[model samples]
Target: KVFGRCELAAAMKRHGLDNYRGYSLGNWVCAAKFESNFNTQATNRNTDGSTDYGILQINSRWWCNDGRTPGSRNLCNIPCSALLSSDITASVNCAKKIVSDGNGMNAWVAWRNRCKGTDVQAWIRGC
Candidate 1:
C-alpha cells in the first residue's frame, strides 16, 4: 500500500513507533520517507546480495530471511516476504527489534544520512 505522510505516521504510531526506543514519531517517519517513500511493496537488492524489504526496508542480511541471501540468520524470526504487505505490523515490530538491538536507528542508513541531527518535527507537523 502507498501511504500519505500523515497516513503513514498514523499507522506506524498505532503500532507503537511513536517514541519507540527513544526515537520520536518524526524520526520514524523520516526514515520511512527516504527509505521507501511510504510504499509497502518496496524492495531493493543490495550489492552484498542481501535485499532490503518493505517500507522500512528490513534487511535480509540479519533481520529477515531471504533464501537468496547467504548467512541470513533471520534474527527477527520473520520471513522476508512477510514484510512486503501493506499490513506493516511485521515491519513495525521488526523495526523495533532492529532499533533496540542496534542501540538506536543505526540499522537504517537512510535515517543516518537524511534524518540524523535534523529537526524531526518537520516530518510530522500538522498530523
Candidate 2:
C-alpha cells in the first residue's frame, strides 16, 4: 500500500523514528519517499546478489534473512520477506537495528543522498 506523505511521517514518528540516532521524523519521511515511495511492497534486487525489501528497502545482505541471500547476517533476525507486509512492525524494528549499528540513517543511500544534507524538516512541514 502507498502511504500519504503525512500519513507515513506520522506513522514513522509513532514508531519512534523521531530523533532516532539524530535522524528526525522528516528524515524518515524523506527516506521513505525515495526508497519505496511509501509503498509497502517495494523491493530492489542488488547486483551484489541481495534484495532490498519494503518501504525502507531493508537489505538482505545484512539486516534480514530470506534464506536465499548469500552470507546474510540477519542482524534484524527477521525474514526479509517480512518487510513487505502492510504492517511495519518488523520493518521499523529492523530499521532501528540498522541505525543502532552505528551506520546512522546513512545506512540508507536514499537518505544519504536525498535527505541528509537537505532541509529534511520540509518533508514534515504542515504535517
TM-scores, each model vs. reference: 0.97, 0.97
What lDDT tens digits, residue by residue, belong to model 2 across residues 9-105?
8888889999988888888899999999999999889998999999999999899998787888999999988899988888999999999997688
* lDDT assessment of candidate 2: 0.90
By summed lDDT, the worst window of 10 consecutive residues in model 2 runs over 102-111
Superposition error at 51 for model 1 (Å): 0.2
lDDT (Cα, 0-100) at 38 in candidate 2: 94
* Candidate 1 per-residue lDDT over residues 13-71, each given as its tens digit: 89999998898999999999999998999999999999999999999989999889988
Off by over 4 Å in 2: none
Please give the lDDT score for candidate 1.
0.93
